Amino acid sequence: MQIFVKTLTGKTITLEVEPSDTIENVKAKIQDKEGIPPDQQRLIFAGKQLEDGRTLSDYNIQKESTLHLVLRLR
Amino acid sequence: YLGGSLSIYIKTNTGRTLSVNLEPQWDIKNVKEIVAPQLGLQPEEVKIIFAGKELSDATTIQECDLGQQSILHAIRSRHFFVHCAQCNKLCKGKLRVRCSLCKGGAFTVHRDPECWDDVLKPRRITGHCESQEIACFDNETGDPPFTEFYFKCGEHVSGGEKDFAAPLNLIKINIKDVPCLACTEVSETVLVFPCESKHVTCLECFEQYCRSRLSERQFMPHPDIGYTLPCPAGCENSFIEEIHHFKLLSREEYARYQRFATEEYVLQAGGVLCPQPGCGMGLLVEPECKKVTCQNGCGYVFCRNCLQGYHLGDCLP
Amino acid sequence: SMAASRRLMKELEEIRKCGMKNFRNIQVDEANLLTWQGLIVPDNPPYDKGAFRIEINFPAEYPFKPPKITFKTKIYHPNIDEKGQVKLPVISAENWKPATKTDQVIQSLIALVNDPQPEHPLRADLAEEYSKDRKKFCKNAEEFTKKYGEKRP
Ligand SMILES: [Zn+2]
Ligand SMILES: [Zn+2]
Ligand SMILES: [Zn+2]
Ligand SMILES: [Zn+2]
Ligand SMILES: [Zn+2]
Ligand SMILES: [Zn+2]
């Protein structure tokens, strides 16, 4: 199944990922397709930050849910 | 009553998959006496599993709450509500189960909970699995994984292996003809609010209330829960703890909920938005750092204390 | 705009059949359902048997958002603005339950009129006046309310 990651700009990116995948995996895919540093990425869905350790299935992400991207300079 | 005839897939312990279509009123014992000569096993040997329960030999096929192109399994041994991506309107959901270790189905569940029960937690019950010659073991792991449930839309054709939907646990059939608070209009399908008083609202009012509290960024913020809504009456500790209910509203009305939630999260957590038009990029800069870049974006540098171009001198106006 | 306007209409109907003496002359312009006109006759002496004309506009989100009330007839009263706007605690968005019926709110407004509250004034001068001196306040009040407002038998 597929999901959408969306920078506030409007730049929508389509990523194939399965429910039982950690946030770390998604981060790795996003950064692989764009070039972001792994640490700089903070995924936010419905106003809550997604913990690297947990999975998408723990947050009940549907087909084509929008996981907005926020970038942490740090 | 369109067709009546049902078509069903059957996945055995072995890799083979068998497509068989039946009439909804055949005995499950008969189905066993049909599957047995299908693979060559004896009729006395076959145990059939579906959604976790050891199927009664006498029960009717139609009784099983079964849709189309669904899957049952076999072995030689001897009123829900969900939101669908394809179906915008919420549909009656069906409950299936999958093994945590091998990510497969066809296992027996120990408790079989009816309704209004403790559920939706990663760790609950362990069960025996058929796949991989009964090799689903937790004895070695120590860290305990468990049989986990999932829901499917029952109004249309489904893909048995991985199809799922969002469960809306706050939506019930009006079994006691309870009137909606907002309209005093008894609706067959309603939503129950998490407060003590058990306030209830129909779907029209869910939508109107949401889309009214939405344009002005009025969603109450809880860290763990998310950006949710308070009770219509404003009852304490009555925040919708599963957000997906908002999907009752369509693309615009809900995606904008997502966007606004993200923006407000960025704003309150200390992060700053992007001033360059049509960027809105939220960049969580380390509190002390005061040079703002736009990571993988418009690279415009602003003071953050002025929302203007990068200036060395302090911004007085 | 469905379970909203229809509820509003139902409330309107019940208010119509409930021809309570204090609130009379209901005028709902058939064009816009969201605006009402009314005429209120207080029993108390400061506004004695003088009908005051009010207008009630309901939001497009009526069931979940408090309606607003303005006074087309000028009135000398502390909790009432010069423009005609009114500060009613039952209305104010800080504490307004959706289930609250229109007639209850109207009754609350009437109660507010009969006995003014100087605790939270929109018009400070009148509040200090009424708090400190009542008789001169009552003189100005009765004078003004006989000067403006159409009497009704
Ligand atoms: Zn569906
Ligand atoms: Zn298994
Ligand atoms: Zn309703
Ligand atoms: Zn409540
Ligand atoms: Zn930018
Ligand atoms: Zn500056």
Swiss-Prot record, chain A:
Transmembrane segments: none annotated. There is a cross-link at K6, K11, K27, K29, K33, K48, K63 (Glycyl lysine isopeptide (Lys-Gly) (interchain with G-Cter in ubiquitin)). The modification Phosphoserine is found at S65. Exists either covalently attached to another protein, or free (unanchored). When covalently bound, it is conjugated to target proteins via an isopeptide bond either as a monomer (monoubiquitin), a polymer linked via different Lys residues of the ubiquitin (polyubiquitin chains) or a linear polymer linked via the initiator Met of the ubiquitin (linear polyubiquitin chains). It comes from the Eukaryota. The record marks R54, R72 as: Interacts with activating enzyme. Signal peptide: none annotated. The gene is RPS27A. Phosphorylated at Ser-65 by PINK1 during mitophagy. Phosphorylated ubiquitin specifically binds and activates parkin (PRKN), triggering mitophagy. Phosphorylation does not affect E1-mediated E2 charging of ubiquitin but affects discharging of E2 enzymes to form polyubiquitin chains. It also affects deubiquitination by deubiquitinase enzymes such as USP30. Residues 1-74 form the Ubiquitin-like domain. This is Ubiquitin. The chain holds residues 1 to 74 of 156 of the full protein. It is found in: Cytoplasm; Nucleus. The record marks H68 as: Essential for function.
From Swiss-Prot, chain C:
Pfam families: UQ_con (PF00179). Ubiquitous, with highest expression in testis. It catalyses: S-ubiquitinyl-[E1 ubiquitin-activating enzyme]-L-cysteine + [E2 ubiquitin-conjugating enzyme]-L-cysteine = [E1 ubiquitin-activating enzyme]-L-cysteine + S-ubiquitinyl-[E2 ubiquitin-conjugating enzyme]-L-cysteine. One of its GO terms (biological process) is cell population proliferation. SUPFAM superfamilies: UBC-like. Changing K97E: Decrease in autoubiquitination. It is an enzyme of class 2 (transferase). The modification N6-acetyllysine is found at K132. InterPro entries: Ub_conjugating_enzyme, UBQ-conjugat_E2_core, UBQ-conjugating_AS, UBQ-conjugating_enzyme/RWD. Residues 3-150 form the UBC core domain. Ubiquitinated. The alteration of UBE2L3 protein levels during the S-phase of the cell cycle is due to ubiquitin-dependent proteasomal degradation. Autoubiquitinated in vitro. Its EC number is 2.3.2.23. Its main location: nucleus. Interacts with PRKN; involved in ubiquitination and degradation of misfolded proteins. Interacts with UBE3A; used by the papilloma virus HPV-16 E6 protein to ubiquitinate p53/TP53. Interacts with CCNB1IP1, CBL, ZAP70, RNF19A, RNF19B and RNF144B. Interacts with ARIH1. Interacts with ARIH2 (via RING-type 1). Interacts with NCOA1; they functionally interact to regulate progesterone receptor transcriptional activity. May interact with NR3C1. Interacts with NDFIP1 (via N-terminus); the interaction mediates recruitment of UBE2L3 to ITCH and causes MAP3K7 ubiquitination. In contrast to other ubiquitin-conjugating enzymes E2, residues essential for lysine reactivity are absent: Pro and a His residues are present instead of an Asp and an Asp residues in positions 88 and 119, respectively. Belongs to the ubiquitin-conjugating enzyme family. Ubiquitin-conjugating enzyme E2 that specifically acts with HECT-type and RBR family E3 ubiquitin-protein ligases. Does not function with most RING-containing E3 ubiquitin-protein ligases because it lacks intrinsic E3-independent reactivity with lysine; in contrast, it has activity with the RBR family E3 enzymes, such as PRKN, RNF31 and ARIH1, that function like RING-HECT hybrids. Accepts ubiquitin from the E1 complex and catalyzes its covalent attachment to other proteins. Mediates ubiquitination by the CUL9-RBX1 complex. In vitro catalyzes 'Lys-11'-linked polyubiquitination. This is Ubiquitin-conjugating enzyme E2 L3. It comes from Homo sapiens. The gene is UBE2L3.
